[PDB]
């Protein structure tokens, strides 16, 4: 028959590699493309890869996640540790939250960061 890969333009879309066969031809697609002639832009978001209510962006051969505040990582799977810098004063114990932290103050101390000393008042 014909070599469809040697007539002129590439019959394979999205820069796929044209491979001649007897009676037809086949396309070797680039990452992110599918179909007999690489016509389809694969939806990389179709398997729901973005966690914790993240927004999935369907791109060429990849997805990108837009994380909700307090989350990070490729799949937004990481709850950022806000306690990392040890923010609680006066031996307060730090509790990690979503884009926030909580201090558990010892008796006689109050405030978000356990700043307020109350021992002198009592």
Q: Which residues bind a copy of itself (CB under 8 A)?
A: 55, 57, 66, 68-69, 99-100, 110-112, 118, 121-122
Give the count of beta carbons closer than 10 Å to the beta carbon of residue 106. 11
For Ca ion, the binding residue among 40, 96, 108, 110 (CB under 5 A) is 96
Q: With CB cut-offs between 5 and 8 Å by kind, which of a copy of itself, Ca ion, none does residue 9 bind?
A: none
Q: Which does 28 bind (CB under 5 to 8 A by kind): Ca ion, a copy of itself, none?
A: none
Q: Which among a copy of itself, Ca ion, none contacts residue 75 (Cβ within 5 to 8 A by kind)?
A: none
What does the alpha-carbon distance between residue 114 and residue 118 come to, in Å, rounded to a whole number?
Answer: 10
Q: From the CB of 34, what's the least distance to Ca ion, in Å?
A: 10
CB 71 within 8 A of CB 54: yes
Residue 59, annotated as binding a ligand: yes
Cα→Cα distances 80→68, 72, 97, Å: 11, 7, 9
Q: Which of 42, 80, 44, 79 is nearest to 65 (CA)?
A: 44
Total binding residues toward Ca ion, as defined by CB under 5 A: 8
Which entry of Ca ion, a copy of itself, none binds 84, CB below 5 to 8 A by partner kind?
A: none
CB atoms within 10 A of CB 56: 19
Binding site for Ca ion (CB under 5 A): 1, 20, 41, 58, 79-80, 82, 96
């Amino acid at each position: 028959d014909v070599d469809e890969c040697s007539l002129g333009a590439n019959p394979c879309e999205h820069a796929g590699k044209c491979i001649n066969t007897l009676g037809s031809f086949e396309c070797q697609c680039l990452q992110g493309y599918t179909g007999p002639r690489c016509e389809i832009d694969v939806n990389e978001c179709v398997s729901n890869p973005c966690q914790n209510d993240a927004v999935c962006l369907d791109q060429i051969g990849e997805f990108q996640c837009i994380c909700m505040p307090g989350y990070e990582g490729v799949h937004c799977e990481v709850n950022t540790d806000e306690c990392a810098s040890s923010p609680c004063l006066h031996n307060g114990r730090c509790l990690d939250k979503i884009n926030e932290f909580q201090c558990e103050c010892p008796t006689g101390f109050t405030g978000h960061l356990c700043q307020v000393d109350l021992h002198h008042i009592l």
